[PDB]
Amino acid sequence: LAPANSEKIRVDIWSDIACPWCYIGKRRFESALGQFPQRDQVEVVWHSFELDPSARPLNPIAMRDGLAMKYSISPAQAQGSLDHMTQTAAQEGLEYHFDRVKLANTFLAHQLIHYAAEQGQGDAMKERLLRAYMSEGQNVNDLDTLQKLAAEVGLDAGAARAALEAGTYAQAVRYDEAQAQQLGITGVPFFVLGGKYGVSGAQAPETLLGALSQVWAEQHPAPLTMLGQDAPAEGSEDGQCAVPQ
Amino acid sequence: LAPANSEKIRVDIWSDIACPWCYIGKRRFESALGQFPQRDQVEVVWHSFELDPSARPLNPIAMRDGLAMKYSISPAQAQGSLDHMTQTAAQEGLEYHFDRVKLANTFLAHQLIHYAAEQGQGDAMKERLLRAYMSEGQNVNDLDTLQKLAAEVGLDAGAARAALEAGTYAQAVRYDEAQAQQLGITGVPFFVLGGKYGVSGAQAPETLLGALSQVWAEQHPAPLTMLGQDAPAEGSEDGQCAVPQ
């Protein structure tokens, strides 16, 4: 989890397309980054996460009922979360329609994001899939649908669908998920900063900005004022006579 | 003859108000300076010089005859120099009228330049006096005239005349002249650059620019590329162990 460039700080993010807090979290992270003076020095690495890797391809029940059954809570509790997430999302410029949500297995969707990332379109693909899931009632387990969404993002639709059908990025997705399991990440969005600090959930942009700033200040403190004269290192049996100063 | 600031190069100039080549030389030095990239790093120090410190206050003969008698040359030789100087001066934007020149002792004029220099007006006073001598037929030994010229430059005319009458700057002028005699300077204009190099006479702006450039390159060479690691100096019985690099 080290940055490719030494001068920079790295942020690793785990996220599932099926999680409304991940879209909210994306917007809040983007806000934080926008306010971070050293944003250009940030390497962001996104990772696939499945809330339920064994989820059936499509569960045709209403999202409220899926939530209630998954979390062992009442339909009323579930609706409460749905309404809260919808209201919170509106403040991030997100208009959700949970009444249309298709409870789909997101494994192929994650593979499509990996394909897109190889074409320089990882973020656009992610954003498109989050919108398709949360607002447009699209089934992101459906290959027709995934291919269409890839086309809308500007990808080679035939090539994208071939990659999905071949399972080209299946291993990469499982690898992302394995990493999260090893780090003890059991919910999303999850941010790792500087390979050291964790932030759990879609916290405020102020909090993410604070983490960025803190990590930056730690890894790049103000340089010391050096006194005296730096000692010669081993191998330097040398000397000079200097002029009176 | 060292510069007040270490970062800079110093040019010392000796000059007499009575010498037409000094006005020409002033213009040519100014041209050179204008073309010198590091002109702001040049400290110019001007010094009084009298061609003839024992010259009578005013010698009423024509400049041609004064020249002929001084240099032991014919009137024709003298007129030849006059015409040549006049033609050369025109190319520097100087319109001479040697037919009007008053052959005056220049000691007081030099004192006035020193007074003016203390008021931040040394150059303007010099320029005014050169013009008065070479073109306007003014007697620069005459106190009325000197006071008037000081007033035209913007000085306190009463204060300037009082300084002349008191002989306040007489010693300073003699000191300038002594320095020239010690350096073996026997004609003007004379330039000393970097306290080391002499340029005799009103040479071309190209030559003065070349001298400036040469002196600059000598005193400020391009820094060396250091190899290895600078040796510790006496008093530094020290060491550290450094990480593998």
TrEMBL record, chains A, B:
A single MF term (Gene Ontology): oxidoreductase activity
Identification of the protein by name: FrnE protein
PANTHER family linked to this entry: GLUTATHIONE S-TRANSFERASE KAPPA, THIOREDOXIN SUPERFAMILY PROTEIN
Gene3D superfamilies membership: Glutaredoxin
Disulfide bond entries: 19-22, 19-241
Alphabetical list of SUPFAM superfamilies matching this protein: Thioredoxin-like
Organism name: Deinococcus radiodurans (strain ATCC 13939 / DSM 20539 / JCM 16871 / CCUG 27074 / LMG 4051 / NBRC 15346 / NCIMB 9279 / VKM B-1422 / R1)
Residues in the signal sequence: none
Pfam families referenced in this protein's UniProt entry, alphabetically: DSBA
Domain annotation DSBA-like thioredoxin: ranges: 10-212
